[PDB]
Design a protein around this ligand. Structure first.
Ligand SMILES: CO[C@H]1CN(Cc2cncs2)CC[C@H]1C
Length: 185
């Protein structure tokens, strides 16, 4: 792909984070802690899952960023509406305001309803995410495999400002402690 020139500098919004997440000083890395991280509750925090939003809001234009997923067993990545539900249980779907892919139990899937199987021959260590607001497109790229396409959501109905979306996943196994990291431009 040739989307690299739309690169944006994403930082994580501490206030949106689940209370078990640990965000680095530079706001560019996040991981699951082994306990509550001693923060106050607020209406922005994702309560049920290890999720956090980027601070940036997008309502026009073309945007690109990259995320490092090295040695993780489970994660979700993409974008979401600013107004997504924060509390309780919900599915990641465009109907609920999410445009995402994930790794779970050694398979990759797109967050459609119902979910779509992805075909990835080279397990990615870094994921590229491209958003074209005007066109209604969210695309995912395998940076480890020379930028090959993973998935395109088209005919997206964003219906609001978009925020970068992250889920570090649970660590029930002891094999999923590694962070998500925003990769440098
Ligand atoms: C209902 O979700 C809660 C779960 N709790 C406890 C758990 C942590 N390790 C496995 S369950 C963490 C904060 C939030 C994600």
């Amino acid at each position: 792909h040739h989307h690299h020139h739309h690169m944006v500098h994403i930082t994580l919004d501490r206030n949106t984070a689940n209370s078990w997440l640990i965000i680095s000083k530079d706001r560019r890395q996040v991981r699951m802690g082994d306990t509550h991280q001693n923060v106050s509750d607020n209406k922005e925090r994702f309560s049920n899952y290890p999720m956090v939003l980027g601070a940036q809001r997008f309502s026009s234009g073309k945007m690109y960023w990259e995320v490092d997923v090295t040695q993780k067993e489970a994660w979700d990545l993409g974008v979401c509406r600013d107004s997504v539900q924060r509390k309780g249980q919900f599915s990641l779907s465009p109907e609920n305001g999410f445009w995402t892919i994930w790794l779970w139990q050694d398979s990759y899937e797109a967050g459609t309803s119902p979910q779509t199987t992805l075909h990835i021959q080279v397990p990615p260590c870094q994921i590229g995410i491209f958003v074209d607001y005007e066109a209604g497109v969210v695309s995912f790229y395998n940076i480890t495999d020379h930028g090959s396409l993973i998935y395109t959501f088209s005919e997206c109905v964003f219906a609001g400002p978009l925020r970068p979306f992250f889920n570090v996943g649970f660590n029930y196994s002891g094999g999923n402690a590694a962070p998500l990291k925003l990769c440098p431009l």
